[PDB]
Amino acid sequence: DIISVALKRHSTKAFDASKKLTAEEAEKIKTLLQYSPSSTNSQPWHFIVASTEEGKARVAKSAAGTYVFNERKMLDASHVVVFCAKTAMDDAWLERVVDQEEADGRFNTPEAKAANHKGRTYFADMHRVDLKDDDQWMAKQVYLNVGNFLLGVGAMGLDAVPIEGFDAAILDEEFGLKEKGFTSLVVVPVGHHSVEDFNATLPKSRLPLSTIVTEC
Amino acid sequence: DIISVALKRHSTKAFDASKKLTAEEAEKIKTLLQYSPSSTNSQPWHFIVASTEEGKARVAKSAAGTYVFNERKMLDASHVVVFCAKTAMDDAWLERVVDQEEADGRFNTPEAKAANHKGRTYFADMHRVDLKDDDQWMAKQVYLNVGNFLLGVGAMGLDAVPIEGFDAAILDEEFGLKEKGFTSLVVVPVGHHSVEDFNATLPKSRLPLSTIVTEC
Numbered sequence: 001d002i003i004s005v006a007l008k009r010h011s012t013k014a015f016d017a018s019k020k021l022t023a024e025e026a027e028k029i030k031t032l033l034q035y036s037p038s039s040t041n042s043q044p045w046h047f048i049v050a051s052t053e054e055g056k057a058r059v060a061k062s063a064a065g066t067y068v069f070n071e072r073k074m075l076d077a078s079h080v081v082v083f084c085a086k087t088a089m090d091d092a093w094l095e096r097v098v099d100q101e102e103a104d105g106r107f108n109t110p111e112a113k114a115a116n117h118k119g120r121t122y123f124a125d126m127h128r129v130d131l132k133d134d135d136q137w138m139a140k141q142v143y144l145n146v147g148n149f150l151l152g153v154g155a156m157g158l159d160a161v162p163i164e165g166f167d168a169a170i171l172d173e174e175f176g177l178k179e180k181g182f183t184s185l186v187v188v189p190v191g192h193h194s195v196e197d198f199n200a201t202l203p204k205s206r207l208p209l210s211t212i213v214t215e216c
Numbered sequence: 217d218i219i220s221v222a223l224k225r226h227s228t229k230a231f232d233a234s235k236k237l238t239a240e241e242a243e244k245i246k247t248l249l250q251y252s253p254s255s256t257n258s259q260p261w262h263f264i265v266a267s268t269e270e271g272k273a274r275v276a277k278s279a280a281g282t283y284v285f286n287e288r289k290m291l292d293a294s295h296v297v298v299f300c301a302k303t304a305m306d307d308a309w310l311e312r313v314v315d316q317e318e319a320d321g322r323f324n325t326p327e328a329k330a331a332n333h334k335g336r337t338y339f340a341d342m343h344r345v346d347l348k349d350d351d352q353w354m355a356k357q358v359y360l361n362v363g364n365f366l367l368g369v370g371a372m373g374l375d376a377v378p379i380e381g382f383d384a385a386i387l388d389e390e391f392g393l394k395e396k397g398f399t400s401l402v403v404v405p406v407g408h409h410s411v412e413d414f415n416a417t418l419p420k421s422r423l424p425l426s427t428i429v430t431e432c
């Protein structure tokens with residue numbers, strides 16, 4: 001049951017540094033990242049997956065100053081995922097997307113690919129040209145990917161914590177992501193909680209359905 | 217297996233208007249909405265769940281003009297979820313979150329409730345006062361709930377389609393959201409696909425791991 005997963009999953013505060021993902025688990029987490037939906041199948045994202053001790057330490061440099069209370073969550077977890085959004089929607093990306101969809105067998109005629117390209121360009125152009133918000137639109141898709149990921153890892157029986165408390169300017173410099181066209185948004189350390197994770201045994205808390213839902 | 221769900225779920229293009237969700241499935245989808253994580257447990261959201269023919273036709277008035285192609289997805293689904301974000305983060309909201317956490321038994325230490333509220337008001341004030349993007353930070357949390365939702369509903373064996381192609385100003389005017397401090401961002405019809413849902417038997421397409429993942 002997925003609902004039991006939803007009620008049991010928690011934001012891990014401390015990871016066991018001796019528990020690592022299997023090679024099968026490492027492959028499956030990467031499948032989850034790749035297969036999330038996105039508006040127009042635009043997939044405007046890049047992911048850093050750090051599993052080495054050198055790589056996690058480099059990600060862990062961004063939990064500087066005020067974000068030092070999240071550094072140990074990055075170093076003790078098995079795999080650390082960095083979710084990055086594209087910084088602008090370019091026309092090369094859109095043609096990369098429609099060429100992948102043709103290569104995957106989604107179009108039956110050249111008119112069906114041209115129709116799909118036109119339709120995606122129009123909605124990319126509403127954000128790029130009309131609203132001037134393509135940066136915010138692509139970042140919103142990366143957060144939907146985070147949502148998908150947290151539930152999926154929970155359903156695999158693993159522990160994780162979504163981190164917004166890190167320095168994105170520090171992280172983007174280290175991996176040289178502005179040169180590559182991307183910016184870091186959320187860091188998700190993945191592994192197994194330890195006995196020091198105080199949040200594992202505390203109750204879940206959410207606003208009641210009376211406040212947050214309207215039925216019509 | 218959750219990886220099977222991720223590879224099997226699709227964006228439905230046509231729903232079977234005779235197939236409805238059971239009362240148990242209706243309750244489970246509201247549990248999925250409420251239990252999604254969000255930064256600092258801010259839960260900066262409101263959900264409209266329309267299951268009646270009158271309710272769904274009111275949501276379908278936003279599938280206007282250029283967006284007429286999404287109208288039928290809203291009309292024939294069993295349940296239509298409107299994901300709304302708060303338009304500003306007020307102190308009143310943060311207080312009801314911390315009081316709910318208090319009632320749920322999260323702070324065994326009355327000094328920890330006060331410690332946690334001011335940390336939440338500190339990270340909410342870095343967006344509503346310092347960075348001035350409180351509306352984008354709260355919309356970001358609503359897309360994380362949408363990603364959580366779409367994988368969960370696929371894990372329950374239901375069909376859905378995330379919709380961005382709707383007129384949010386019509387949708388907000390129709391349900392008086394602007395005066396309640398909420399704005400609609402994503403519409404998600406849930407139900408069971410028709411025999412004429414062409415997308416159900418098309419192959420899934422995504423960019424390769426070689427483009428989207430960097431391993432470190």
Ligand SMILES: Cc1cc2nc3c(=O)[nH]c(=O)nc-3n(C[C@H](O)[C@H](O)[C@H](O)COP(=O)(O)O)c2cc1C
Nearest residue numbers: 009010011070161162163164165253254255256257
């Ligand atoms: C976008 C996002 C960012 C978060 N950032 C942090 C963080 O920097 N550090 C942390 O300890 N937890 C962080 N969390 C945890 C939230 O406090 C948490 O999801 C929320 O309190 C609900 O608890 P649950 O995850 O255990 O269900 C973050 C969560 C989200 C969704």
Ligand SMILES: Cc1cc2nc3c(=O)[nH]c(=O)nc-3n(C[C@H](O)[C@H](O)[C@H](O)COP(=O)(O)O)c2cc1C
Nearest residue numbers: 037038039040041225226227286377378379380381
């Ligand atoms: C945020 C968002 C908005 C979308 N808006 C629309 C829409 O307006 N109409 C539609 O038919 N599909 C829409 N979709 C479906 C996307 O085209 C689809 O998710 C994508 O092609 C990947 O296909 P899949 O969901 O079948 O895996 C949307 C998806 C997302 C995530």
